[PDB]
Amino acid sequence: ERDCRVSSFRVKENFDKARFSGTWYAMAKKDPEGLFLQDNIVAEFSVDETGQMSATAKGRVRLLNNWDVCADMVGTFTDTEDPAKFKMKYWGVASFLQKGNDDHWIVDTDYDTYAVQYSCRLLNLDGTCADSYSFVFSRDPNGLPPEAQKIVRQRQEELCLARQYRLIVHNGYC
Numbered sequence: 001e002r003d004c005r006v007s008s009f010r011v012k013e014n015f016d017k018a019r020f021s022g023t024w025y026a027m028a029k030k031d032p033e034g035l036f037l038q039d040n041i042v043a044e045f046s047v048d049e050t051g052q053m054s055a056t057a058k059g060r061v062r063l064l065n066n067w068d069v070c071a072d073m074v075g076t077f078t079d080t081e082d083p084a085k086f087k088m089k090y091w092g093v094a095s096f097l098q099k100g101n102d103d104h105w106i107v108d109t110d111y112d113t114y115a116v117q118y119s120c121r122l123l124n125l126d127g128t129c130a131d132s133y134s135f136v137f138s139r140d141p142n143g144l145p146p147e148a149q150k151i152v153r154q155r156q157e158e159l160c161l162a163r164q165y166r167l168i169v170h171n172g173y174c
C-alpha cells in the first residue's frame with residue numbers, strides 16, 4: 001500500500017541551517033551496502049556567512065579483518081531547489097578514509113531535540129531505493145524523549161526503513 005518511491009518522501013519544510021548547527025549525536029543508523037561508520041558517531045554542523053552548511057563527524061569505523069579506527073570526517077553541503085535536500089561531498093582527514101558524494105536529506109527535525117537524515121545512493125528502476133542509509137540524531141547523547149521517539153518511528157516508517165535500524169552506542173571510544 002504505502003509509497004516507498006524516493007520521489008514521494010516528504011522532507012523538512014523551510015529547513016533552517018542555522019537552527020540545525022551544533023552537536024548531533026547519532027542514536028540509530030540504517031546501514032548502506034559496505035557500511036562505514038560503526039558507532040560512537042557524533043556530528044558537528046556549521047553554517048557560514050554565505051549560508052553554506054558544512055559538518056564534521058567522529059566515529060569508530062572497522063576496516064576489514066577487524067581493525068578498529070576512530071574516523072575523523074569532513075562534509076560540505078551544496079544546496080538544491082529544496083531547502084532540506086543537499087548534495088554532500090565528504091572525505092576523511094586521512095587520505096585513505098572513504099570519500100564520495102551522497103544525497104543528504106533532512107527528512108524531519110525540531111532542531112533542539114531530534115533529527116532524521118536520509119540518503120539514497122542508488123535508485124531501483126521502480127523509484128524505490130536500492131541502496132540507502134539513514135541516521136537518527138539527538139541533541140542529548142542519552143537519547144530522545146518519548147514524544148520525539150514516537151515522531152521518529154513514524155518518519156522511519158515513512159521512509160520504509162523502520163525495521164532496518166540499529167542502535168548506535170556511545171562509550172567514549174573516541
Ligand SMILES: CCCCCCCCCCCCCCCC(=O)O
Pocket residue numbers: 031032034035036037043055056057073074075090091117133135
Ligand atoms: C550524515 C552523516 C553526518 C554528515 C557529516 C558529514 C561528515 C562526513 C560524512 C561521512 C559520510 C560517510 C557516512 C556514510 C557511510 C556510512 O556511514 O556507511
Ligand SMILES: [Cl-]
Pocket residue numbers: 162163164
Ligand atoms: Cl520494527
